[model samples]
Target: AKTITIKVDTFKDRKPISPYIYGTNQDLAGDENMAARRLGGNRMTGYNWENNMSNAGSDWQQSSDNYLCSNGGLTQAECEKPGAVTTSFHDQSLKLGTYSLVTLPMAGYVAKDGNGSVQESEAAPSARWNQVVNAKNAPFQLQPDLNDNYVYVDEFVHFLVNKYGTASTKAGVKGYALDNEPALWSHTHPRIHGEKVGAKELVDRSVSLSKAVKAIDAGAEVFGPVLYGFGAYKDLQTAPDWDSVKGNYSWFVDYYLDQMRLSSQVEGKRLLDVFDVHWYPEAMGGGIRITNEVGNDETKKARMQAPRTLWDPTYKEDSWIAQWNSEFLPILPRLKQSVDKYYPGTKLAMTEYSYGGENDISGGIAMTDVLGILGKNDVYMANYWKLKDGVNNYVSAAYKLYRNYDGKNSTFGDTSVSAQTSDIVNSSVHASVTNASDKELHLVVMNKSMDSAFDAQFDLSGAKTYISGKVWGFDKNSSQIKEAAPITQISGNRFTYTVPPLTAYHIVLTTG
Candidate 1:
């Protein structure tokens, strides 16, 4: 048996965990136990709320249509209903008692009709597309005017606020994002915004849209930059004007936060509530992207180990990203560093991320590790972006292990406690405490070994005498999370247990 020792202290690095961390990009149906869901993507980049039309852009054939209903079996007439897609998403989120994060178009225009793609001959300011205005001079309308030849995002935010309430209310939309990836706008939606966006223009647009959102609903959180990947994080993929600002700031994140902080000061309030970015890892194992090739031994090993890149400085994966950009190899601390240095107290949002292997045990371990990393790093909000459809049983179980492992809405503790592992390569551990009393101790344990089981020794230095504990998780035997053996042996908060190989576990220790 491989022995791994873990130390837990509830008072160290403890912070209130954000309930909105376990979010998803796809619409929820209430059974998923997700605390948040986002209405966004490339389709949202050019979405027209008034007509429920959207442009596929470079993701497809630059086609515009009722694309939101492509999978909903919605008829053209029903899809044409104003705000139908957004309404359905927000309504579903509210019904599920979840936080909603909606995206607002700021790429200059949106689809005016479902006829087809916006051709080069008919670009922005043309009849085929409607101009996107950040503010509305006239009174806000619950029902947007269809014949105005322009769509106002402020009016849309106002409509949602009126239909529901302010973000402070339970029924309101809690957040709004400043649109999808902007770095690739010219190549992705050439017909709409063909010119490459610069760093200055991006921040200015973010300020305008964010102010508009704040003006309508003062409590709503605004997420911006919406960067795409590693390249985007580094000088916004070398934006045309990045050369002018590169000497002043190390990377785009620093510059964005600094500029946003300046704007917040001038506005007398925080304009950017969340520093949002999307991370699709460039890590590779066995010469393949772990996200794309998760079926083999090599890929599974890579997938399970890849989450370390988010925080672990000693373990760099075999990827071009780590090879060339090792300075930012560990991403989580760098993010916190930037925020603390430039925009103190600014929240962080990964918004969209994935660890692959949805149908396999490796995916389950990867996701559990990723969630714990996000929590321990103090990420304000995050969403898992599934690339393709598999049964997704393993990935779904990962969420369940933390959210509803007991078939109830019981979750990992509210405050992240310090959990240190003696052996990180073979295994990893994260712990939490439920409240100030610190009576209930929850652990997210991962056995990263391929075949050897872990005989884990845990020491709870700051916890009560946990009389009993139980285990809940999945393994190769069954991907669905089910109750495992109980923790019968306890000696003053120190216990030894055997964790199955290649498995992830949620161990709940209670006062009893």
Candidate 2:
């Protein structure tokens, strides 16, 4: 409907894009351009590295079964052996040439038997569970004994280090998350953690376990206090000690960082390497949750615009969070401010998050925008949580458009650069370069309007000169990324092209 100008300066606001930002929550196979994978979720909180047993509160069948590791194709005997599930999951990462983030349980107990719902009677010190010890007095073993009377986290790290190499190696685990969703421990796994987790207890357990992890391998990174969502971020779901500390800190993030900083000083090494959190957008459109439904009309519109909540202070979602916690509305910046004020240099991570559709074009649009956003904001890592099915799903197409847009394993540059648009409401643009020595520039441009097409004018500027461009993208009509006509006209590093509605692209420009 109109000609819009997109500005891209490859020299400004530049940073090395975290290869892990193109990551997912569960293990993914084949050539999906997945850079990292995380073995986390409710099952991991009560996961016992020994015996491959895990207690799923409500996600699985509410039992301490071998469901977490049963998919490894190992016989019942071998599947139940120590580190089978974790090792199996790690193997998937190694095979795919991707990094892995392992979850270390600090929920006090791990499943002892693959029995039905554990009762308060069968808690730790009983037969149905094993006590979760952060450290062990004994020496580390290559293969841990199953009947050690306790599960030591440090020993688990040692076991992995022996199997794979240290974190410095490509085959080793990249990071360790301090359990999963501790804010909902009592609600999610009532039999194990019946009492609400207090801020003091959470900090104490996290620091202790972190120290234990560092004791074994300082090469690996440790993430802590994995907040569930906005509720936990606000006040740890009104953690028992939240009120007492609320007067001193704005929210749980501040308190966690402040406490970790103090403890790191005492421990003489950085304990928390990443501030991890999980978020599934609560925004809804036309009374349908974006995380659940992908309605055609109004719902799709909301999905295209919902990603603004992560960083846009001007755009507010139609959710309860916006009504109450609008002060901390733009989550990415607020969280960074807290980290800067309390513990500067601590990396930021979004280990688990979702924008709903994985098979719809809207899913592609939202995901494409999200990847650009995370990279632009200098996020250390951001992993997507699986909410849909299919191998080459629509969400996979998003990663393809950015990472494998040419269907030849090509990708947007790893170094993100400055880019902006004239029509911010209907368009999003990101630019990048492969490295400091490369002259080829990459761009991700999104035409987000529902029905209107735009003639996009590319106004390029930087140290490199670009003459020709190759465009590859996917529209609402097809899930596959198809190539388009090349740019044959360029005068003074400026060119105009047409982009249809609900379309996105990964364009490679060069001076050659």
Candidate 3:
């Protein structure tokens, strides 16, 4: 058995992990109506419909706008005119309110229309959204319009406040992602942005839009850049344009932070609140294929270990990324360091990420492990791109472990604490103390070993001497959050237990 020790005394001040971290990119608004059933599909940016509903259909026209205006406390004249009535403007609020679900909303500011240039009206669908049913191509490639840099954001923020209120509630949209993967616009929507997009162009737009958002709702957080992955972070896809500018070649994030810091000071208000990115690791077998689809033994093993690319400083992944940059990819820390250096107080978020094979036990383990890393490293928010439909899937089980511990309303603690271990290679541990008066402690332990049950020794400091704790675990052989035995042995503030191979445990300790 490999033993591990947790040094609980080195406690750090608590930073509340927003519950919105467990969010997803979803069509919470557009899917409510039958006419606009899939109008602004989950994949398309919601900003298009929010700005103008003309293209979706006549059903989402004036009458619908009037209904929306009336419901939103507008006057009779306002309902009749309903200036700039966005389609299903209130649908997202209604749907979320019905189900009582919270999400980090993504809003787009279309800068151009379908004609391949900036436009004032609602932009046409970009190539990414204009899909053909069964043919090789669609009749027209959609073009995404950049929202008017100055005024579109102001209008959108006003609209959002009108429909969903300033802060997130039962029917409100809380945090906003500036735009989805703006770096990939050229490739994803070639018709509008063409083959190359200047790094400066996107950053300027982000700064402007972020300013507009802050002006209206100072409390609402603004997340941006939304880079797609490791390559995008460096702007490696378009090296010529990326490296030609001032302060070039020092990693794209560095440049972005410098610009934002200067802009925030010049404007006298924080422009960017969260540094957001999307990562789809390519180290797993089949490279880009889903994890469950990769069946080779070696490939599966590699897939299981891919989560280390996020924070592990020693593990060199087997992928093109390693070839391009041989240095270790401790992404979270690297980004944090950049934020600290260039733009202090700016938060970080991975809005989209998945390791594949949601049905496999490895997927659950990976999800659980990544969630721990995100919380431990002070990531402000994260959302799985898509969640499995049923609890039977291991991926959903991973979420339930922290979000819904028991059949009741139990959940992980809000404040994270230092829970260092001796051997992070074979096992990973994270601990948190709750915000309530009881100050309950929650510890999550992950055993990466696939074939061995390891014994772990836990020690506590700065507080109670003796405590009672309960444990819950999930493994390859199980699909439910099952209660394990209590912590029977306790010497002062120390205890020992055996963790089964390839499993995740959620332990809750109470001093009372």
Candidate 4:
């Protein structure tokens, strides 16, 4: 481990973070066989073109059997199955690393037997509205087969608490999402239509679910409204009686917040915990309009491009999307303001966002999108939707990308800084904090450029800290960052150097 010159007075004060992030899939628990076996598997079923690989086509059950779980949705006894309890999760020794978030899904599925009886269910809030608790006895209605649904829920919760839960692993999961895109857009959601869980019902269920989870594990942060878009700008403007039909996720958040405020209960607290929204386009790879094709041909089609010209989906170079990242930004400052105003110091996250119909690792295109999301908002944590390698999981190299702004700072302080990178391939540099202490100053930069690298410079003399420093680079070529070369100071504080193509870099300078 080659060390940088930057020094910190106390190790406790130093937050060694690269800010690159990733997340996992929730469909791991839905596979019926998996659910029955105790590997805690989930599969996607009953969605539009999505269900082409339906219940009959694949062995979701056997595919799920390999995993370790305390119990399957089939029986509570499965929670303590041999090897099921221990191998579930182990972050204690892995050093939680540094990330804005870790997103996992709550049980979000429903299954019914052929006789219209519910066999299995998870997070089926519609049970309360439909007046029927399926096989799961989930307390919802309309889907039928309530018995199996109850069994599934019982098994699902048992798996989490027994296998992945804190008491079990001691390193329990911190963040959870109820459902993704339960709105009318992503897919025809049966839960919303199953029991007619309109706005109020939706909010009520979310609150109930969140409370239930909290009661079980007091340390978890529950997020909801997995809406597909910015809830405010559209649905609130067009829908008739928008307040009543909270099915649209955007409206649900504000309504929920209002309810919290009125009741003086969750009012001052972050109700949604973490806000959810998704971004997608019709096509991703260049010249490829790939949608729901699953064969080898479709997989080949998805990889059909080196890179496409990335631009603002908002139709112009100047879209509000650019400014509203997870980090502090002007566009969503008010969202934070509301959090601070009511809850005071709340964190936000972008649960699911990506270019429409494209793979996350369409070369470096998907990585670019991920960088922008984290760079632009007070988005404390944002993960590219697809992190898995096989199956439906999309891949991305964004996690390996980094950038540098040639400008230098002697000390890392409250004073803010910005960078200017050429729009070549629409690559951008998201600025991470630079720290100075213990005879060293460190500057971290994320160059979101996919293919084209830039020659950038930093001017540090103004800060009046370190006059001379060594510059090392970290990118895909060599993540350990071996090049410890000196920078060329052209004029005043500006030092110039060319960065490796499409990657991230951290520049360190010694003040001692």
lDDT of 1 by residue, 1-512 (tens): 67889998877888878878888987433345898888888999899988888999988878888778765456767786777788788887877888889999989999988888667888777878999999998997777899878999988888888788899998999889999999989889887899888999999999998888898888998888889988999988779999997777889999999999999999998998888999987777777787785757888888999999999989989888899989987998988899889999889999898878878888889888988889878898899887866467777888888888888878898788889999998788988887755578899898988889989999887646788899997888797778989998788889988888988889998887
- Model 1, position 190: C-alpha lDDT score: 88
**Where in model 1 is the C-alpha error above 4 Å?**
27-30, 70-78
Residue 41 shift from truth in candidate 3, angstroms: 10
Judge candidate 4 at residue 21 and give its lDDT.
Answer: 28
Judged by lDDT relative to the true structure, which candidate is superior, 2 or 4? 2
1-512: candidate 4 lDDT, tens digit per residue: 11112212222333333232233232221110100011111222221110111111122321212122312122335332322232323232123322212222222333322112222252244331122111243442222232432223222333455545543244455555544444432123333233333455445556655555554555565555555554332342233456555553333445545554443364333445555444432332333433333224333323222112122223212223333421222324535454445434445555554432223233233343445434444555544443333433223233322332232212222212343343423334433334534444444443444455566645443344445656544444533334456753435445565655534444555544
| TM-scores, each model vs. reference | 0.96, 0.96, 0.75, 0.56
TM-score of candidate 4 against the unseen true structure: 0.56
Residues 243-298 of candidate 2 have per-residue lDDT tens digits of 88766788889989999999999989999999999989988887887888787577
Per-residue C-alpha lDDT of model 3 across residues 62-142, encoded as one tens digit per residue: 111223333335565533332223324346335543211121213332322222222224233432222111111222112
TM-score of 1: 0.96
| RMSD each, Å | 1.8, 1.7, 9.3, 10.6
Clashing residue pairs found in predicted model 1: none
Clash pairs detected, candidate 3: 29-92, 109-147, 110-145, 110-146, 110-147, 111-145, 111-146, 111-147, 112-145, 112-146
Worst 10 residues of 1 by lDDT: 23-32
Candidate 2 off by > 4 Å: 72-77, 119-125
